[PDB]
Each structure stands twice: as C-alpha cells, then as structure tokens.
Amino acid sequence: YTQINLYVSFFPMNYDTQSELELMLRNATNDQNFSDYLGAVNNLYQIPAG
Amino acid sequence: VEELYVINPINQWPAPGSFSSQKPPGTLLPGEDPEAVFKQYHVVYLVPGAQYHWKNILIEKPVWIYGNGATVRTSGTGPILRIVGNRTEK
Amino acid sequence: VEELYVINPINQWPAPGSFSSQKPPGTLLPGEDPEAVFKQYHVVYLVPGAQYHWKNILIEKPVWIYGNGATVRTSGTGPILRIVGNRTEKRDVRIQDISFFGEDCTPNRMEPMSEKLVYQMAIWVTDMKRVTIKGCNFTNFAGAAVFFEETAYNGFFWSMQHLITECRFTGCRIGIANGGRSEYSTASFNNFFDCQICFNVVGGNWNRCGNIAANCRCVYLHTTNMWYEGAGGNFNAAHGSFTGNTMNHCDYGGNLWPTAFQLPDREIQLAGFYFDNARARCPTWTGNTQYYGDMKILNFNQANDAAIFVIDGCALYGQPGDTGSIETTAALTDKVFIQGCQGNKVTLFNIKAANVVPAIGTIKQKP
C-alpha cells in the first residue's frame, strides 16, 4: 500500500434546519439503533475425514 | 487434525492394565538379543539395511533368516551364529 | 462404530502444525521420482505387481531393489537405470525380481545395428563393483540388455565380482554385453530366446555355466572393434569359461534374425560361435550342446604355439547340407582339436582327420 485516504461527504444542510435536527438527536430518547442482518453466532465443529 | 474432544478428570482410581506388547510381528530390531527371538518364531525378518552386532548366537531349532540387506559385524573369539541341531528336525 | 464423542467449536486460533510425513517406510510408489528415493535409503522395496515407467535413473550409491514382481517400462533414447559408481563403495547392488520391458513389441529384427540403437539398454553399470541381477525378465531391447563397462584400474585389483543368474531374455538384439576390463564375474542359467547375440564378449575371464540359447543367431561374439566396448576398451580379452551351455538351432530350424550384423567398422556373417581376434586366446569349451549351430574359428593367438582350441565333450549334430558346420581358417588347421564329441554327420571345414577323436562328421575344405 502506498497511500490510503478516507472519503466522507457532508450534506449541505441549512444551519437553522441543522440546529433543530441535532437538538433532537442529542436527546436520550432518540438514540440511533441498528441490527445485524445476518444475526447469528458462528460455531465451526470439527468433523474428521471419513 | 486438532482433536477438540472434551475430557473428564481422572477419578483417583487404580488404573486398569494397559499393555503394548506384540510390537514386532516377526522382525528383529538392532540392539535386541537374538537368542530369545530365534526360539519363538520360525521365520525371522531383519530390518532392511540395518547394522547388527552378533556373537555366539546359539540356534537350536531350525529357523529362516531373511536378511533384507542387513549387516552383521562381530568382535571377539567366538563364532557368529552357532547352529547346533539334533537328528530329528523336519 | 458410530463415534458419538462430543466436540467443542474451534476458537479461531492459528492451528498448530500437523504433518503427515514418513508415509513410505522404505517403499517406492508408482509415479514417484526414484532418484530422490535411491539417494535416501539402502534397501528400496517396490509395490507388488505394479506398473512403473523409468528413464535414465541415475544411481550413485549402492542400493538394493526388491522388485516383488514389478514391471518397469520405458520410452526414449536413454537407458533405464544408469548405475555410476566410484572405487570406494563397501556395499553392493542387488537388482531382483523385476520385469524390464522395452520400447518395442515383437522387435524390428530386420533393422540394422547402428549408433542410434546403442543406448537402448536397461542396466548400464559404469564402474560399480559387486552388482547382482537375479530373477529378471528382459524383453524387446533394440540394443543391449545389460552392459558392464569398466574404466582403467591398476594394481591387479580384479575383484568386481558380478552375478547374472536366473534371467529370461526374449527379443533382445544383444544379451549380456560387457565392456573391456570387466573381469572375473559369472553369468549362468540365463534362458535366452530369439536373440541375435547372446554374449557380446569384450572383457575376459568370465564364467558361463548353464545358459540356454534357443532360436538365437549368435551366442559368443568376439571380433576386433565390436559395439559396446566403453572406456578402457578391447584389452586382455576373451579368457572366460563356457561350460555346459545350450545353443541349439542357430542356423537351421526356428531362427529368425539375419546373418549380417554391421559392426562399426565393417559387416560380418554371424555364426553360433564367431571368434576373430589375433591377440586373444580361446575359452574353455566343455559340455555344450549344439543342434544346427555354426562355429567360425577365424583367428586366435597360435603365434608361438601359445594357444590350442579344443572342443571337449560336446554335441555337434548338423545333417542337412552345411547347417551347424564348423569353419576354421586353413592357417589354423593344426591348432583346432576336437577330443571327445558326438555328432550326426556334420561338415568340418579345414579340420584334419587325425585331430578329431572319435571320427565323426564330414571333412571338407573351404579355400
């Protein structure tokens, strides 16, 4: 590897629409929650040959 | 290839008798006394390309010795491989 | 019989090193390179009843090859199983129970011998001492079957004690060949069949004590400048023994090879016993059976009453025409004797009547 960068993108929201949106998302009842799509626990059990 | 079978601990018993005999089927390893092997078997194989050292090996019963390229050296005043018979051997 | 032991899952570790080496104890599987196995072991077993394919197997250290009924085929211009030695080897070589085949089937017996076919052998020992070829089957070789070369040695070290016994040679153009200075070894009880030359003799002092040569054109060839001389060539030659052998049907009957041979210098007419060398003496000749087998005594060392060729206790038995006839040079009539013999009525070319006891055969002259 020679050089490796990180590319994000800022959506140009209006600053008055911004300060309403961040003030609702700083609140503890509006916590962003996510979930794994696979949703499983890997367990690889050894089977010998034959 | 990693043997992840579970194990329970030993229960401080006297262990049952484990034996590992019959390790030669009919062969003869180097550094082993040949007089106790020639008494037991009829056909005695040898280790291929081995390096032996025999002296005054008394043979009474008729056996066959497949050498398989073995090398028997000696040192001393005795013969190698003394073969003493009787009249009654088929 | 069902293996219901419980198992815990693997813990995403790097696994420890598992190896499965030492799968041959000393054996040699088919389709495996033999040069890396002959280097490692001293005794090499083979798979019983296998089917191999070898070509130019270089052997440097003396090993033993138990064949166990194996079959080694080949294809190409190289020999099988090249055995190159040094002077300093205490061990010996024993090649045993292998059926060597060739790159032929019902071989081209009308093709003349040339430089192209000279490397079509199966065992070519360069200077390895104490080799042993025991219980083999050599079929369909356009060149020699074996060839025992020997380089220049000194100090009366005549040792090199080789044995070639219990072999079966079919269709080989030349049977046991031997180079110069390959002295004092035995080659007996080898049952020849359908060969052009059974012995391309260059080295002397051999011992041939029971070989059977049925339907073979020539059995004993010795000229000047043959094929298969090697380094250290035609020197101190043709001193061997030849006792109790069998060379029936060499000229009449079931013989299939032509008479011309095409040596590297000239062409010659083969016989059942062809001998032409002014510097070499004659082998001992006892107990041999000849049915329809020619003999050509051309030249040996009779110069200062130094050699006399004597046939003793042998069968001659050639009736029709000149089949099985014995031919001598007219300058060699006083030195070819036949004392003790049985014959049908065989043509003797240039042999006096008083020199043969008992009185058998027809005496003619070939100027």
mmCIF file of all heavy atoms in Angstrom, chain A residues 46, chain B residues 1-5, chain C residues 7 9-16 18:
data_model
loop_
_atom_site.group_PDB
_atom_site.id
_atom_site.type_symbol
_atom_site.label_atom_id
_atom_site.label_comp_id
_atom_site.label_asym_id
_atom_site.label_seq_id
_atom_site.Cartn_x
_atom_site.Cartn_y
_atom_site.Cartn_z
ATOM 1 N N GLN A 46 -15.503 -29.472 14.308
ATOM 2 C CA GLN A 46 -14.579 -30.272 13.523
ATOM 3 C C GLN A 46 -15.165 -31.646 13.239
ATOM 4 O O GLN A 46 -15.612 -32.343 14.153
ATOM 5 C CB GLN A 46 -13.256 -30.405 14.272
ATOM 6 C CG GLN A 46 -12.193 -31.176 13.534
ATOM 7 C CD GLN A 46 -11.780 -30.505 12.248
ATOM 8 O OE1 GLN A 46 -12.148 -30.944 11.161
ATOM 9 N NE2 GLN A 46 -11.010 -29.431 12.364
ATOM 10 N N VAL B 1 -7.879 -32.756 12.947
ATOM 11 C CA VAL B 1 -6.444 -32.507 12.919
ATOM 12 C C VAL B 1 -6.015 -31.699 14.138
ATOM 13 O O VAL B 1 -4.857 -31.302 14.253
ATOM 14 C CB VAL B 1 -6.034 -31.788 11.625
ATOM 15 C CG1 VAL B 1 -6.340 -32.657 10.414
ATOM 16 C CG2 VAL B 1 -6.743 -30.453 11.518
ATOM 17 N N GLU B 2 -6.957 -31.456 15.047
ATOM 18 C CA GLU B 2 -6.681 -30.691 16.254
ATOM 19 C C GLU B 2 -7.229 -31.342 17.523
ATOM 20 O O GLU B 2 -6.731 -31.028 18.613
ATOM 21 C CB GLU B 2 -7.236 -29.263 16.105
ATOM 22 C CG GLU B 2 -6.712 -28.225 17.095
ATOM 23 C CD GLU B 2 -7.300 -26.847 16.860
ATOM 24 O OE1 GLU B 2 -8.091 -26.690 15.908
ATOM 25 O OE2 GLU B 2 -6.980 -25.924 17.635
ATOM 26 N N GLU B 3 -8.202 -32.256 17.411
ATOM 27 C CA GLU B 3 -8.661 -33.160 18.476
ATOM 28 C C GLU B 3 -9.238 -32.390 19.670
ATOM 29 O O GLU B 3 -8.686 -32.378 20.771
ATOM 30 C CB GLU B 3 -7.530 -34.100 18.919
ATOM 31 C CG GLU B 3 -7.030 -35.020 17.821
ATOM 32 C CD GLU B 3 -8.044 -36.075 17.450
ATOM 33 O OE1 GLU B 3 -8.762 -36.542 18.355
ATOM 34 O OE2 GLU B 3 -8.130 -36.433 16.257
ATOM 35 N N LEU B 4 -10.377 -31.740 19.411
ATOM 36 C CA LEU B 4 -11.073 -30.953 20.424
ATOM 37 C C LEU B 4 -12.136 -31.746 21.167
ATOM 38 O O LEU B 4 -13.140 -31.161 21.594
ATOM 39 C CB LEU B 4 -11.717 -29.711 19.811
ATOM 40 C CG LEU B 4 -10.889 -28.474 19.499
ATOM 41 C CD1 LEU B 4 -10.195 -28.635 18.184
ATOM 42 C CD2 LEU B 4 -11.770 -27.252 19.484
ATOM 43 N N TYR B 5 -11.967 -33.055 21.309
ATOM 44 C CA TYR B 5 -12.889 -33.830 22.122
ATOM 45 C C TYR B 5 -12.709 -33.454 23.585
ATOM 46 O O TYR B 5 -11.587 -33.232 24.044
ATOM 47 C CB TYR B 5 -12.642 -35.320 21.934
ATOM 48 C CG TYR B 5 -12.836 -35.832 20.530
ATOM 49 C CD1 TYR B 5 -11.753 -36.239 19.761
ATOM 50 C CD2 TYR B 5 -14.104 -35.950 19.988
ATOM 51 C CE1 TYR B 5 -11.935 -36.727 18.478
ATOM 52 C CE2 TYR B 5 -14.297 -36.431 18.713
ATOM 53 C CZ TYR B 5 -13.216 -36.819 17.962
ATOM 54 O OH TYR B 5 -13.421 -37.300 16.689
ATOM 55 N N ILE C 7 -17.943 -32.623 20.872
ATOM 56 C CA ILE C 7 -16.915 -31.775 20.290
ATOM 57 C C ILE C 7 -17.199 -30.331 20.687
ATOM 58 O O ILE C 7 -18.359 -29.919 20.797
ATOM 59 C CB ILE C 7 -16.847 -31.988 18.757
ATOM 60 C CG1 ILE C 7 -15.624 -31.314 18.146
ATOM 61 C CG2 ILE C 7 -18.136 -31.600 18.057
ATOM 62 C CD1 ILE C 7 -14.346 -31.991 18.500
ATOM 63 N N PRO C 9 -16.414 -26.210 19.687
ATOM 64 C CA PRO C 9 -16.035 -25.499 18.465
ATOM 65 C C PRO C 9 -14.624 -24.945 18.547
ATOM 66 O O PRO C 9 -14.076 -24.720 19.628
ATOM 67 C CB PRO C 9 -17.062 -24.370 18.378
ATOM 68 C CG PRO C 9 -17.461 -24.129 19.759
ATOM 69 C CD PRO C 9 -17.443 -25.461 20.434
ATOM 70 N N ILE C 10 -14.032 -24.744 17.369
ATOM 71 C CA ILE C 10 -12.691 -24.187 17.297
ATOM 72 C C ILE C 10 -12.730 -22.713 17.678
ATOM 73 O O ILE C 10 -13.717 -22.007 17.438
ATOM 74 C CB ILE C 10 -12.091 -24.426 15.897
ATOM 75 C CG1 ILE C 10 -13.003 -23.909 14.780
ATOM 76 C CG2 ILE C 10 -11.850 -25.910 15.692
ATOM 77 C CD1 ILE C 10 -12.690 -22.515 14.247
ATOM 78 N N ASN C 11 -11.650 -22.240 18.296
ATOM 79 C CA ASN C 11 -11.653 -20.945 18.963
ATOM 80 C C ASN C 11 -10.953 -19.864 18.139
ATOM 81 O O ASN C 11 -10.387 -18.923 18.705
ATOM 82 C CB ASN C 11 -11.017 -21.089 20.347
ATOM 83 C CG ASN C 11 -11.452 -20.004 21.313
ATOM 84 O OD1 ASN C 11 -12.197 -19.094 20.951
ATOM 85 N ND2 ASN C 11 -10.997 -20.102 22.550
ATOM 86 N N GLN C 12 -10.978 -19.998 16.805
ATOM 87 C CA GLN C 12 -10.385 -19.051 15.845
ATOM 88 C C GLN C 12 -8.892 -18.830 16.092
ATOM 89 O O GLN C 12 -8.361 -17.748 15.842
ATOM 90 C CB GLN C 12 -11.130 -17.714 15.833
ATOM 91 C CG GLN C 12 -12.593 -17.822 15.447
ATOM 92 C CD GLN C 12 -12.803 -18.269 14.019
ATOM 93 O OE1 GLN C 12 -12.068 -17.874 13.121
ATOM 94 N NE2 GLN C 12 -13.820 -19.089 13.803
ATOM 95 N N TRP C 13 -8.222 -19.853 16.607
ATOM 96 C CA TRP C 13 -6.789 -19.835 16.817
ATOM 97 C C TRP C 13 -6.054 -20.083 15.514
ATOM 98 O O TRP C 13 -6.608 -20.652 14.576
ATOM 99 C CB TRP C 13 -6.404 -20.922 17.809
ATOM 100 C CG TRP C 13 -6.596 -20.575 19.213
ATOM 101 C CD1 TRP C 13 -6.761 -19.335 19.737
ATOM 102 C CD2 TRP C 13 -6.653 -21.489 20.300
ATOM 103 N NE1 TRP C 13 -6.908 -19.419 21.098
ATOM 104 C CE2 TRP C 13 -6.849 -20.736 21.467
ATOM 105 C CE3 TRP C 13 -6.555 -22.876 20.401
ATOM 106 C CZ2 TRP C 13 -6.947 -21.316 22.718
ATOM 107 C CZ3 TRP C 13 -6.655 -23.450 21.650
ATOM 108 C CH2 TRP C 13 -6.848 -22.670 22.790
ATOM 109 N N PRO C 14 -4.782 -19.685 15.423
ATOM 110 C CA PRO C 14 -3.910 -20.308 14.426
ATOM 111 C C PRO C 14 -3.652 -21.752 14.826
ATOM 112 O O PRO C 14 -3.223 -22.031 15.948
ATOM 113 C CB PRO C 14 -2.641 -19.452 14.472
ATOM 114 C CG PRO C 14 -2.660 -18.816 15.813
ATOM 115 C CD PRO C 14 -4.104 -18.602 16.154
ATOM 116 N N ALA C 15 -3.949 -22.676 13.917
ATOM 117 C CA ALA C 15 -3.871 -24.093 14.227
ATOM 118 C C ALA C 15 -2.412 -24.532 14.383
ATOM 119 O O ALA C 15 -1.527 -24.009 13.707
ATOM 120 C CB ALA C 15 -4.542 -24.911 13.128
ATOM 121 N N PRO C 16 -2.143 -25.471 15.289
ATOM 122 C CA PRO C 16 -0.775 -25.986 15.418
ATOM 123 C C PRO C 16 -0.391 -26.854 14.232
ATOM 124 O O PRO C 16 -1.233 -27.348 13.480
ATOM 125 C CB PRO C 16 -0.828 -26.802 16.713
ATOM 126 C CG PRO C 16 -2.255 -27.184 16.853
ATOM 127 C CD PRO C 16 -3.044 -26.041 16.301
ATOM 128 N N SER C 18 0.371 -29.607 11.893
ATOM 129 C CA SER C 18 0.074 -31.017 11.674
ATOM 130 C C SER C 18 0.781 -31.492 10.413
ATOM 131 O O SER C 18 0.634 -30.885 9.346
ATOM 132 C CB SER C 18 -1.433 -31.249 11.558
ATOM 133 O OG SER C 18 -1.957 -30.629 10.397
#
